Amino acid sequence: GPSVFLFPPKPKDTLMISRTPEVTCVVVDVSHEDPEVKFNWYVDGVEVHNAKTKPREEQYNSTYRVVSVLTVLHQDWLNGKEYKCKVSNKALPAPIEKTISKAKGQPREPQVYTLPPSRDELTKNQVSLTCLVKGFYPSDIAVEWESNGQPENNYKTTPPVLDSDGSFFLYSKLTVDKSRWQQGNVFSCSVMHEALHNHYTQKSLSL
Amino acid sequence: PSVFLFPPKPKDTLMISRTPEVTCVVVDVSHEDPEVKFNWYVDGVEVHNAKTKPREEQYNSTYRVVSVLTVLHQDWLNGKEYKCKVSNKALPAPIEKTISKAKGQPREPQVYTLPPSRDELTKNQVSLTCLVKGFYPSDIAVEWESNGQPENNYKTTPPVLDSDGSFFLYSKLTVDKSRWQQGNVFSCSVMHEALHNHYTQKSLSL
Ligand SMILES: *[C@@H]1O[C@H](CO[C@H]2O[C@@H](C)[C@@H](O)[C@@H](O)[C@@H]2O)[C@@H](O[C@@H]2O[C@H](CO)[C@@H](O[C@@H]3O[C@H](CO[C@H]4O[C@H](CO)[C@@H](O)[C@H](O[C@@H]5O[C@H](CO)[C@@H](O[C@@H]6O[C@H](CO)[C@H](O)[C@H](O)[C@H]6O)[C@H](O)[C@H]5NC(C)=O)[C@@H]4O)[C@@H](O)[C@H](O[C@H]4O[C@H](CO)[C@@H](O)[C@H](O)[C@@H]4O[C@@H]4O[C@H](CO)[C@@H](O)[C@H](O)[C@H]4NC(C)=O)[C@@H]3O)[C@H](O)[C@H]2NC(C)=O)[C@H](O)[C@H]1NC(C)=O
Numbered sequence: 001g002p003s004v005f006l007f008p009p010k011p012k013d014t015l016m017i018s019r020t021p022e023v024t025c026v027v028v029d030v031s032h033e034d035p036e037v038k039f040n041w042y043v044d045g046v047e048v049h050n051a052k053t054k055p056r057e058e059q060y061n062s063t064y065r066v067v068s069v070l071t072v073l074h075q076d077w078l079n080g081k082e083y084k085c086k087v088s089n090k091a092l093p094a095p096i097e098k099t100i101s102k103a104k105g106q107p108r109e110p111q112v113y114t115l116p117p118s119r120d121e122l123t124k125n126q127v128s129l130t131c132l133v134k135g136f137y138p139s140d141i142a143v144e145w146e147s148n149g150q151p152e153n154n155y156k157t158t159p160p161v162l163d164s165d166g167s168f169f170l171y172s173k174l175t176v177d178k179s180r181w182q183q184g185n186v187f188s189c190s191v192m193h194e195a196l197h198n199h200y201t202q203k204s205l206s207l
Numbered sequence: 208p209s210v211f212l213f214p215p216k217p218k219d220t221l222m223i224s225r226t227p228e229v230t231c232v233v234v235d236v237s238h239e240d241p242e243v244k245f246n247w248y249v250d251g252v253e254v255h256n257a258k259t260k261p262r263e264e265q266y267n268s269t270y271r272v273v274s275v276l277t278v279l280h281q282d283w284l285n286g287k288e289y290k291c292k293v294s295n296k297a298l299p300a301p302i303e304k305t306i307s308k309a310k311g312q313p314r315e316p317q318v319y320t321l322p323p324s325r326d327e328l329t330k331n332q333v334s335l336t337c338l339v340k341g342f343y344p345s346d347i348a349v350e351w352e353s354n355g356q357p358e359n360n361y362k363t364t365p366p367v368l369d370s371d372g373s374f375f376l377y378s379k380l381t382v383d384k385s386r387w388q389q390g391n392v393f394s395c396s397v398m399h400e401a402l403h404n405h406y407t408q409k410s411l412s413l
Pocket residue numbers: 210211213214215216228230234235236265266267268269271
C-alpha cells in the first residue's frame with residue numbers, strides 16, 4: 001500500500017548551529033478507505049514526541065500524501081544517532097520502519113585543491129575553473145563558489161565519487177568569461193564538512 | 208513481474224570490432240509461473256534475435272531472466288527504436304518497453320587535461336584531471352593510457368547536464384607522484400560519435 005521515504009538533513013543544516021537540521025518522513029500512495037496515517041519517531045530506540053505532522057493532502061492520482069518532520073540536534077546527527085520513522089496505516093500488514101543516520105565510518109579531513117583552466121581551453125570564450133576535494137568522509141559535504149565576496153551563478157558540482165581507500169572525492173566547475181580570468185579575478189571554492197575545523201575552509205584561484 | 212530495458216555501452220557502438228547489444232531484464236518471476244517469452248521490435252518490424260541468457264534465482268526466491276538483443280552500430284546511431292515485449296502468466300497483459308538513443312544533433316566533445324594542483328604535490332600520489340565537455344548525447348567513454356599501456360587507477364564522474372544543454376564530466380587518474388615528475392606522458396582517450404573516427408586523445412605531462 002503506502003510507500004515510506006525518509007530524507008536525511010541537508011549537509012549544511014547539521015554543520016551550522018544557525019541552521020536547523022530536520023529529518024523528513026514522506027508517505028505517499030494513501031487510499032481513501034484507509035487515509036489516516038500515524039508516525040512514530042525513535043532516536044537510538046527511544047521514542048520522541050517533538051515532531052510536527054501536517055494534515056494529509058490529496059494528490060492528483062486519487063491518493064493522499066502525508067509528511068512528518070522531526071527536528072534533530074546538530075551534535076546528535078554528527079554523533080550519528082539513528083532516526084526511525086514508524087508509519088502505521090490500517091491498509092498495511094505491519095507498520096513500516098525506515099531508519100536513516102550519518103554514514104558509518106571515520107570522519108576524515110577533506111583536502112581542497114583548485115586547478116587553473118587548461119591552456120588548450122584558453123582559445124575559447126568560456127574557460128573552466130576546477131575545485132578538487134578529496135579524502136573526505138562521509139559523503140555529506142557542501143561546495144560553493146564566490147568571487148569578490150559575492151557568490152557566482154553559473155557553476156556546477158559533480159556528485160561525490162568513492163575512491164579505493166574508503167574516501168570520497170568530487171569536482172566543481174565554475175565557467176567564467178576569458179576576460180574575467182585574464183584580469184586576475186579571484187575565485188574561491190568554499191567547502192563545509194564535519195571533519196573541517198569550524199566546518200569551513202577556503203582556497204583562492206586566480207590567473 | 209517487471210521489465211527493465213538497457214541501452215548498449217558507448218564504446219561498443221563506436222567500434223565495428225565490438226558488439227553493441229540491448230539488454231532486456233525481467234525480474235519478479237514467480238516459481239509457479241516461470242514461463243517468459245520475449246518479442247523484439249525494431250521500428251515496428253519484428254526481429255527474432257532473442258537469445259535468453261540463463262536465469263538466476265535471487266535472494267528473495269524469484270528469477271531474473273535476461274534477454275540480449277545485439278543491434279547494428281549504425282542502426283543504433285540513427286535513432287531507431289527498439290521494443291522489448293515480455294509475456295508471463297503472472298502479468299495481466301504483456302509489458303512492452305521501448306528505448307532509443309537521445310534525439311538531437313551530436314556535439315563535438317572538447318578534451319582538456321589539467322595538471323595536478325601545486326598544493327597537491329605534497330602527497331605521495333597525485334591526481335590527473337581530464338575535462339570533456341560540450342558533447343551530446345551523454346553516451347561517452349573515457350580511458351587512460353601511458354606509453355601504449357592502459358592506466359587502470361582512475362575514476363570518472365557520470366555525465367552532468369550543463370547550462371547550454373550539453374554534458375560534461377571529469378576523469379581523475381591517480382598515479383605515483385614520482386612518475387608525474389619524471390616526465391612521463393599520459394593520454395586521455397575519449398570515444399564520442401561526433402568526433403571524426405569516433406576517437407580523439409589529449410596528452411598530459413609535466
Ligand atoms: C528479487 O530480487 C531481484 C534481484 O535480486 C537482487 O536484487 C538486488 C537489488 C540485490 O539487493 C540482491 O539482494 C538480489 O540478489 C530484484 O530485482 C532488483 O531490484 C532492484 C530494486 O529493488 C533493482 O535496483 C535497480 O538499481 C539500478 C541501479 O543501477 C545499478 O545497479 C544494477 C546492478 O546492481 C544495474 O542497473 C547497474 O549495473 C549494470 O548492470 C549490468 C550488468 O552487466 C550492465 O547493464 C548492461 O550490461 C550489458 C552487458 O553487456 C551491456 O553493457 C548494457 O549496455 C548494459 O546496460 C552494466 O554493465 C552495469 N553497470 C555498472 C556500472 O555496473 C548499476 O550498477 C537502478 O538504475 C534501477 O532503476 C530504477 O531505479 C529506481 C528505484 O527507486 C526507479 O524508481 C527508477 O524509475 C529506475 O527505473 C527506470 O529509471 C529510468 C530513469 O529515467 C526511467 O527512464 C525508466 O522508465 C525506469 N524504469 C521503469 C520500468 O519505469 C533499479 O533501482 C535491481 O537492479 C534488481 N536486481 C538486479 C540484479 O538487477 C527484485 O525486485 C526481487 N523480485 C521480487 C521481489 O519479486
